[PDB]
Structures are given as structure tokens and as C-alpha cells.
């Protein structure tokens, strides 16, 4: 997994709220399943395969949480943020 080789998520930054600073990419057994946006220095709840995961983001979009086996969600700061 090199996130520099991952195409951008299919994002929509709503103009009515702050732009999220992170891209997230979800993998099962190292194959991309989906991708999206989330805020840095923040938190979200995300369905990761069969489980709900509470995912914390740091200031560089490093993501942490209790992922089920086989699954990961990796973050990266969007260009210019």
C-alpha cells in the first residue's frame, strides 16, 4: 500500500461547511474497497466491513481505531492542507 498511487476518492466538498483536510482509503486484505474524506484532528464513526469503528484523525490525517482483521483504513492529508 502506497497511498501516493491511490486515485482520489469520489469526493464532494459541500460549500456550506468547512472542507475536510483528509482523504481516507479502506482496504480489505490490501485491496481498496472505498475511499472518502474526513476532518483532521477529529473523529468519525465508520462501518468497516462487519464492524462499526471509531476512527481518530491526527493533524496529519493519521487514522487510528479498532479495525477488524483483514481491514484497514489509512489517511492522508489532502494536497494543500
Amino acid at each position: 500500500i502506497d497511498l501516493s498511487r491511490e486515485r482520489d476518492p469520489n469526493f464532494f466538498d459541500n460549500a456550506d461547511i468547512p472542507v475536510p483536510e483528509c482523504f481516507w482509503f479502506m482496504f480489505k486484505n490490501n485491496v481498496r474497497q472505498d475511499a472518502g474524506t474526513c476532518y483532521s484532528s477529529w473523529k468519525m464513526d465508520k462501518k468497516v466491513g462487519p464492524n462499526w469503528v471509531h476512527i481518530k484523525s491526527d493533524d496529519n490525517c493519521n487514522l487510528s481505531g479498532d479495525f477488524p482483521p483483514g481491514w484497514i483504513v489509512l489517511g492522508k492529508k489532502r494536497p494543500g492542507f
Binding site: 476518492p9 464532494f12 459541500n14 461547511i17 468547512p18 481498496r32 472505498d34 473523529k43
Partner: protein
């Protein structure tokens, strides 16, 4: 108190209809299609009832499930 919720919805035409159903719900400010499969509705609003949305989408469109909940960082 703004929220971003993402709901995955089986939308193979119907996407129109799903989006119409969501953008009309109480509290909803916006809905747009996201995701690698173009099948995640990204719903932004105040006081949005996810359960209600998922339920209606099941009734009217086809399988729906809540996949992301993020408070809007201000």
C-alpha cells in the same frame, strides 16, 4: 450541531429518486453522491434522523445502510 452522514444505497439507474427522498427530509441541507461505486449518499444537515432515512430508502429504493457518521468540525 451539524452532521455528515453517509448512507450506502443500491442505486443503479433511482439515484435521482433516492436523492429526492433524502433532500426533502427534515434537517437535511444537502445530499450528494460520493464513493468509488457512486453509491454512497453524503448527507449534511442539522437534526438528521439516520435511522429514518435508512428505513425510507429501504422501503422506496432498495438496500440501504448507514456507513459513516462525522460531526462537522467548525
Amino acid at each position: 450541531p451539524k452532521q455528515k452522514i453517509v448512507i450506502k444505497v443500491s442505486m443503479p439507474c433511482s439515484r435521482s429518486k433516492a436523492m429526492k427522498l433524502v433532500v426533502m427530509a427534515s434537517g437535511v441541507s444537502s445530499v450528494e453522491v460520493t464513493g468509488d461505486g457512486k453509491d454512497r449518499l453524503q448527507v449534511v444537515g442539522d437534526g438528521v434522523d439516520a435511522a429514518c432515512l435508512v428505513t425510507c430508502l429501504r422501503k422506496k429504493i432498495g438496500h440501504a445502510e448507514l456507513v459513516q457518521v462525522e460531526e462537522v468540525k467548525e
